[PDB]
């Protein structure tokens, strides 16, 4: 059965320690851009191949952003939220001012856009 965005998310989550870490958000970001570019199959295959070579699942996610062409020179997605508290506790210390030209393949997972207009980049 064709792997869905949700199936892939759950497969990746199964391998990650903790919850709501920056890698969890990256899984969400990768699956969304993957689905929108009909690339869930190759992303899943790259993920599995990295783990089978003995990479940690965190390193496997980083390699997807470098090896799957849709992530090449891609800006992080904007994620509209209300306040900073809407960001999971485990991501809090990874939040930074947004740089000029942040890129997914440089570790900028996403940009949180807050109600009051504040913006925060999520960095791995």
UniProtKB/Swiss-Prot annotation:
Numbered residues of crosslink Glycyl lysine isopeptide (Lys-Gly) (interchain with G-Cter in ubiquitin): 93
Domain VP35 IID: 1-124
Residues bearing PTM Phosphoserine: 101
Modifications made to the protein after synthesis: Phosphorylated by host IKBKE. Phosphorylation contributes to efficient viral replication and transcription. Ubiquitinated by host TRIM6 to facilitate virus replication.
Compartmental location: Virion; Host cytoplasm
Physiological role: Plays an essential role in viral RNA synthesis and also a role in suppressing innate immune signaling. Acts as a polymerase cofactor in the RNA polymerase transcription and replication complexes. Serves as nucleoprotein/NP monomer chaperone prior to the formation of the large oligomeric RNA-bound complexes. Regulates RNA synthesis by modulating NP-RNA interactions and interacting with DYNLL1. VP35-NP interaction controls the switch between RNA-bound NP and free NP and thus the switch between genome replication and genome packaging into the nucleocapsid.
The family this protein is said to belong to: Belongs to the filoviridae polymerase cofactor VP35 family.
Record text on subunit structure and interactions: Homodimer. Homooligomer; via the coiled coil domain. Interacts with nucleoprotein NP and polymerase L; VP35 bridges L and NP and allows the formation of the polymerase complex. Also interacts with VP30; this interaction is regulated by VP30 phosphorylation. Interacts with host IKBKE and TBK1; the interactions lead to inhibition of cellular antiviral response by blocking necessary interactions of IKBKE and TBK1 with their substrate IRF3.
Entry protein name: Polymerase cofactor VP35
């Amino acid at each position: 059965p064709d792997i869905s965005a949700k199936d892939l998310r759950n497969i990746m989550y199964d391998h990650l320690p903790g919850f709501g870490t920056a890698f969890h958000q990256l899984v969400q970001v990768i699956c969304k851009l993957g689905k929108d570019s009909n690339s869930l199959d190759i992303i899943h295959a790259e993920f599995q191949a990295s783990l089978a070579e003995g990479d940690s699942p965190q390193c496997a996610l980083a390699q997807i952003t470098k090896r799957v062409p849709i992530f090449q020179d891609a800006a992080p997605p904007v994620i509209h939220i209300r306040s900073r508290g809407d960001i999971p506790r485990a991501c809090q210390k990874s939040l930074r001012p947004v740089p000029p030209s942040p890129k997914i393949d440089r570790g900028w997972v996403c940009v949180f856009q807050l109600q009051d207009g504040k913006t925060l980049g999520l960095k791995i």
